[PDB]
């Protein structure tokens, strides 16, 4: 547990990356998080929204 | 049927063909929600409820 | 752009709209910056039967 200041930075960077990756699963009001599922279900007039 | 006792037919294992459901001048309104009528021939749905 | 259509199909002239006229008769882009002028014309074209 002595090397704590070096492990803290690695843990913070890993958690930042994990949050940035998990943010790709949110919908933000849309019907699906995957863009392929939106481009294969809706038309360009309604897919932009 | 009426609007208070409306039938609900559970679609099952089949090969749906939405080609002639919209390309036919026999329907007054064909409003789709969540999907586009032109993409229904490419989607494989889990369960359809009429 | 002068052309003649029938009833509800005339209201089917709009940017990003599905229908019969928009499909093959007359398509309007989803960038249309103009105006659609339509008026009823009964007793100038209607023939017997």
From Swiss-Prot, chain B:
Changing residue 24 to F: In strain: Omicron/BA.2, Omicron/BA.2.12.1, Omicron/BA.2.75, Omicron/BA.4, Omicron/BA.5, Omicron/BQ.1.1, Omicron/XBB.1.5, Omicron/EG.5.1. Attaches the virion to the cell membrane by interacting with host receptor, initiating the infection. The major receptor is host ACE2. When S2/S2' has been cleaved, binding to the receptor triggers direct fusion at the cell membrane. When S2/S2' has not been cleaved, binding to the receptor results in internalization of the virus by endocytosis using host TFRC and GRM2 and leading to fusion of the virion membrane with the host endosomal membrane. Alternatively, may use NRP1/NRP2 and integrin as entry receptors. Binds to host ACE2. RBD also interacts with the N-linked glycan on 'Asn-90' of ACE2. Cleavage of S generates a polybasic C-terminal sequence on S1 that binds to host Neuropilin-1 (NRP1) and Neuropilin-2 (NRP2) receptors. Interacts with host integrin alpha-5/beta-1 (ITGA5:ITGB1) and with ACE2 in complex with integrin alpha-5/beta-1 (ITGA5:ITGB1). May interact via cytoplasmic c-terminus with M protein. May interact (via N-terminus) with host bilirubin and biliverdin, thereby preventing antibody binding to the SARS-CoV-2 spike NTD via an allosteric mechanism. The lineage of its organism: Viruses, Riboviria, Orthornavirae, Pisuviricota, Pisoniviricetes. This is Spike protein S1. The gene is S. It comes from the Viruses.
């Amino acid at each position: 547990s002595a090397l704590g200041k070096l492990q803290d930075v690695v843990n913070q960077n890993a958690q930042a990356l994990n949050t940035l990756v998990k943010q790709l699963s949110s919908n933000f009001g849309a019907i699906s998080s995957v863009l392929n599922d939106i481009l294969s279900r809706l038309d360009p007039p309604e897919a932009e929204v | 049927a009426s609007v208070y006792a409306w039938n609900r037919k559970r679609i099952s294992n089949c090969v749906a063909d939405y080609s002639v459901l919209y390309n036919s001048a026999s329907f007054s309104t064909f409003k789709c929600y969540g999907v586009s009528p032109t993409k229904l021939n490419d989607l494989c749905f889990t369960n359809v409820y009429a | 752009d002068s052309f003649v259509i029938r009833g509800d199909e005339v209201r089917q002239i709009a940017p990003g709209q599905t229908g019969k006229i928009a499909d093959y008769n007359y398509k309007l882009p989803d960038d249309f910056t103009g105006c659609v002028i339509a008026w009823n014309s009964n007793n100038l074209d209607s023939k017997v039967g």
